[PDB]
Design an enzyme around this catalytic site. Structure first.
Site, PDB file in Angstrom:
ATOM      1  N   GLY A  82       0.767  -1.249   0.000  1.00  0.00           N
ATOM      2  CA  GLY A  82       0.000   0.000   0.000  1.00  0.00           C
ATOM      3  C   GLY A  82       0.794   1.292   0.000  1.00  0.00           C
ATOM      4  O   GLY A  82       1.994   1.298   0.286  1.00  0.00           O
ATOM      5  N   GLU A  83       0.094   2.406  -0.278  1.00  0.00           N
ATOM      6  CA  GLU A  83       0.662   3.751  -0.374  1.00  0.00           C
ATOM      7  C   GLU A  83      -0.214   4.839   0.263  1.00  0.00           C
ATOM      8  O   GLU A  83      -1.429   4.684   0.393  1.00  0.00           O
ATOM      9  CB  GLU A  83       0.882   4.104  -1.857  1.00  0.00           C
ATOM     10  CG  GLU A  83       2.333   4.071  -2.302  1.00  0.00           C
ATOM     11  CD  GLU A  83       2.534   4.132  -3.806  1.00  0.00           C
ATOM     12  OE1 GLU A  83       1.737   4.815  -4.491  1.00  0.00           O
ATOM     13  OE2 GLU A  83       3.496   3.502  -4.303  1.00  0.00           O
ATOM     14  N   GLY A  84       0.436   5.944   0.617  1.00  0.00           N
ATOM     15  CA  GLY A  84      -0.156   7.156   1.169  1.00  0.00           C
ATOM     16  C   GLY A  84       0.514   8.385   0.583  1.00  0.00           C
ATOM     17  O   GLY A  84       1.540   8.260  -0.099  1.00  0.00           O
ATOM     18  N   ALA A  85      -0.058   9.582   0.833  1.00  0.00           N
ATOM     19  CA  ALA A  85       0.435  10.872   0.327  1.00  0.00           C
ATOM     20  C   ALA A  85       1.901  11.161   0.702  1.00  0.00           C
ATOM     21  O   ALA A  85       2.604  11.813  -0.076  1.00  0.00           O
ATOM     22  CB  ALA A  85      -0.453  11.996   0.838  1.00  0.00           C
ATOM     23  N   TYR A  86       2.358  10.659   1.868  1.00  0.00           N
ATOM     24  CA  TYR A  86       3.708  10.870   2.398  1.00  0.00           C
ATOM     25  C   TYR A  86       4.330   9.572   2.979  1.00  0.00           C
ATOM     26  O   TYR A  86       5.123   9.628   3.929  1.00  0.00           O
ATOM     27  CB  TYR A  86       3.680  11.983   3.469  1.00  0.00           C
ATOM     28  CG  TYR A  86       2.646  11.782   4.559  1.00  0.00           C
ATOM     29  CD1 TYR A  86       2.987  11.194   5.772  1.00  0.00           C
ATOM     30  CD2 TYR A  86       1.332  12.209   4.387  1.00  0.00           C
ATOM     31  CE1 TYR A  86       2.044  11.022   6.784  1.00  0.00           C
ATOM     32  CE2 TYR A  86       0.381  12.046   5.394  1.00  0.00           C
ATOM     33  CZ  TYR A  86       0.742  11.452   6.591  1.00  0.00           C
ATOM     34  OH  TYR A  86      -0.189  11.280   7.586  1.00  0.00           O
ATOM     35  N   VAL A 109       3.292   1.392   2.785  1.00  0.00           N
ATOM     36  CA  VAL A 109       2.986   0.254   3.654  1.00  0.00           C
ATOM     37  C   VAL A 109       3.612  -0.991   3.033  1.00  0.00           C
ATOM     38  O   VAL A 109       3.479  -1.221   1.826  1.00  0.00           O
ATOM     39  CB  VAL A 109       1.470   0.065   3.939  1.00  0.00           C
ATOM     40  CG1 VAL A 109       1.253  -0.817   5.169  1.00  0.00           C
ATOM     41  CG2 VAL A 109       0.766   1.403   4.133  1.00  0.00           C
ATOM     42  N   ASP A 134     -12.575   9.849   7.075  1.00  0.00           N
ATOM     43  CA  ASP A 134     -12.102   9.293   5.805  1.00  0.00           C
ATOM     44  C   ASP A 134     -12.430   7.781   5.670  1.00  0.00           C
ATOM     45  O   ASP A 134     -11.590   6.994   5.218  1.00  0.00           O
ATOM     46  CB  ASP A 134     -10.593   9.574   5.610  1.00  0.00           C
ATOM     47  CG  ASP A 134     -10.077   9.431   4.187  1.00  0.00           C
ATOM     48  OD1 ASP A 134      -8.846   9.342   4.012  1.00  0.00           O
ATOM     49  OD2 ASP A 134     -10.907   9.392   3.250  1.00  0.00           O
TER      50      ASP A 134
HETATM   51  C1  LIG Z   1      -1.916  -1.790   8.851  1.00  0.00           C
HETATM   52  C2  LIG Z   1      -2.199  -2.516   7.615  1.00  0.00           C
HETATM   53  C3  LIG Z   1      -2.009  -3.939   7.576  1.00  0.00           C
HETATM   54  N1  LIG Z   1      -2.198  -4.765   6.558  1.00  0.00           N
HETATM   55  C4  LIG Z   1      -2.678  -4.162   5.341  1.00  0.00           C
HETATM   56  C5  LIG Z   1      -2.948  -4.913   4.187  1.00  0.00           C
HETATM   57  C6  LIG Z   1      -2.642  -6.322   4.087  1.00  0.00           C
HETATM   58  C7  LIG Z   1      -2.955  -7.062   2.966  1.00  0.00           C
HETATM   59  C8  LIG Z   1      -3.604  -6.494   1.856  1.00  0.00           C
HETATM   60  C9  LIG Z   1      -3.936  -5.125   1.923  1.00  0.00           C
HETATM   61  C10 LIG Z   1      -3.630  -4.353   3.020  1.00  0.00           C
HETATM   62  N2  LIG Z   1      -2.928  -2.774   5.303  1.00  0.00           N
HETATM   63  C11 LIG Z   1      -2.682  -1.997   6.361  1.00  0.00           C
HETATM   64  C12 LIG Z   1      -2.893  -0.578   6.008  1.00  0.00           C
HETATM   65  C13 LIG Z   1      -3.397  -0.182   4.747  1.00  0.00           C
HETATM   66  N3  LIG Z   1      -3.411   1.170   4.665  1.00  0.00           N
HETATM   67  C14 LIG Z   1      -2.904   1.701   5.858  1.00  0.00           C
HETATM   68  C15 LIG Z   1      -2.621   3.113   6.014  1.00  0.00           C
HETATM   69  O1  LIG Z   1      -2.305   3.620   7.103  1.00  0.00           O
HETATM   70  N4  LIG Z   1      -2.753   3.899   4.840  1.00  0.00           N
HETATM   71  C16 LIG Z   1      -2.701   5.351   4.861  1.00  0.00           C
HETATM   72  C17 LIG Z   1      -3.472   5.870   3.614  1.00  0.00           C
HETATM   73  O2  LIG Z   1      -4.767   5.354   3.565  1.00  0.00           O
HETATM   74  C18 LIG Z   1      -1.301   5.911   4.757  1.00  0.00           C
HETATM   75  C19 LIG Z   1      -1.121   7.266   5.096  1.00  0.00           C
HETATM   76  C20 LIG Z   1       0.134   7.858   4.971  1.00  0.00           C
HETATM   77  C21 LIG Z   1       1.229   7.109   4.523  1.00  0.00           C
HETATM   78  C22 LIG Z   1       1.071   5.755   4.199  1.00  0.00           C
HETATM   79  C23 LIG Z   1      -0.188   5.155   4.307  1.00  0.00           C
HETATM   80  C24 LIG Z   1      -2.604   0.622   6.699  1.00  0.00           C
END
Ligand SMILES: Cc1cnc(-c2ccccc2)nc1-c1c[nH]c(C(=O)N[C@H](CO)c2ccccc2)c1
Length: 331
Positions: free
Chosen positions: A24-28, A31, A141
């Site tokens: 995953g990704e975010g603005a700054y 993941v 959000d």
């Molecule tokens: C904690 C976590 C654990 N597992 C997974 C995950 C696992 C498998 C498939 C998809 C997601 N996602 C997360 C997870 C997904 N988004 C976020 C998360 O915090 N995303 C936000 C933006 O929405 C973000 C904000 C700023 C910088 C980077 C990222 C956490």
């Protein structure tokens, strides 16, 4: 071995966390999934680089402060936090969290959900939201990409960056684009509609087009629906539009459960004062099978930020981020 790299981002999380993969990704930030050699499990590592912008620093501090105090089954927690030993070398922060299987955005892109799973996912969003709202906090959000699922179908709410004490345009409440806890209910309404058809109910391109999409299904608003402190440009636009008929819910979602559409109608109410509350939504006949107030906990006390985070400079926020993460350091 040295610092690991993923899609251009460098992750100095070793030697404890190794073999990183993009998730995953975010603005700054980014993941990644990583192997924890202490707990002998794969974990999630969120790298954030917010120190160039004041807004990104407060969004980072708000999330870290909220997630550390909160303790709920349907809300993501913080297991560990990594950052440089000194403030001068702290360019990044690594938030270690429980690794999930998928998110609702991915699930709705590949799979069709049965009524039982739509009902179970909706229940868990509202169960988690009941705890968030009882703490006098707004997520602001809520969207499928911020709803994480495990193998057993357990849901967890993530991204408390935009969270405030009581965003993505498609799940944004009409009152935000015209001029509270009800804004999260509207988002849950949009999420429910997306679960029923595997597509966004209101995919607007800009703020007035987003209102146009909402009016396209709900129909032209009543006098009471427009009895608020509306923006002159938005008010003049709504009054200039031709009459729009209300599209019935059973017409938009032909094979949907009639109880699901009744709750959807109560969540997707133009007027936030006439919009259903989180505890009222849990009590709705659609979620009767899972409704259990004895196993729907609330926060011990309301949440409050002692400092005015909006008014603090970027440097002061860095100091507070450094202090909040000090507990996770050895010593
Ligand atoms: C904690 C976590 C654990 N597992 C997974 C995950 C696992 C498998 C498939 C998809 C997601 N996602 C997360 C997870 C997904 N988004 C976020 C998360 O915090 N995303 C936000 C933006 O929405 C973000 C904000 C700023 C910088 C980077 C990222 C956490």
């Amino acid at each position: 071995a040295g610092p690991e790299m993923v899609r251009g981002q460098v992750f100095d999380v070793g030697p404890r966390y190794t073999n990183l993969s993009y998730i995953g990704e975010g603005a700054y930030g980014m993941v990644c999934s990583a192997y924890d050699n202490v707990n002998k499990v794969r974990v999630a590592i969120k790298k954030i680089s917010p120190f160039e912008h004041q807004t990104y620093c407060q969004r980072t501090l708000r999330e870290i402060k909220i997630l550390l105090r909160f303790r709920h089954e349907n809300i993501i927690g913080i297991n560990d936090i990594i950052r440089a030993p000194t403030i001068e070398q702290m360019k990044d922060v690594y938030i270690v969290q429980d690794l999930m299987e998928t998110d609702l955005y991915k699930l709705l892109k590949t799979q069709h959900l049965s009524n039982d799973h739509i009902c179970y996912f909706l229940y868990q969003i509202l169960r988690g939201l009941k705890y968030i709202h009882s703490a006098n906090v707004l997520h602001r959000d809520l969207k499928p990409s911020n709803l994480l699922l495990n193998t057993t179908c357990d849901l967890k709410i993530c991204d408390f960056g935009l969270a405030r004490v009581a965003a993505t345009r498609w799940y944004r409440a009409p009152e935000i684009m015209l001029n509270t806890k009800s804004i999260d209910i509207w988002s849950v309404g949009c999420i429910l509609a997306e679960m029923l058809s595997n597509r966004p109910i209101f995919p607007g391109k800009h703020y007035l087009d987003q209102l146009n999409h909402i009016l396209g299904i709900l129909g032209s608003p009543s006098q009471e629906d427009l009895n608020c402190i509306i923006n002159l440009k938005a008010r003049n636009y709504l009054l200039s539009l031709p009459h729009k008929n209300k599209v019935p819910w059973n017409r938009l979602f032909p094979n949907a459960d009639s109880k699901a559409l009744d709750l959807l109608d109560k969540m997707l109410t133009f007027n936030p004062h006439k919009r259903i509350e989180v505890e009222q939504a849990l009590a709705h006949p659609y979620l009767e099978q899972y409704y259990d107030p004895s196993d729907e906990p609330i926060a011990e006390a309301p949440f409050k930020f002692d400092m005015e985070l909006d008014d603090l400079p970027k440097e002061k926020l860095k100091e507070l981020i450094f202090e909040e993460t000090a507990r996770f350091q050895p010593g």
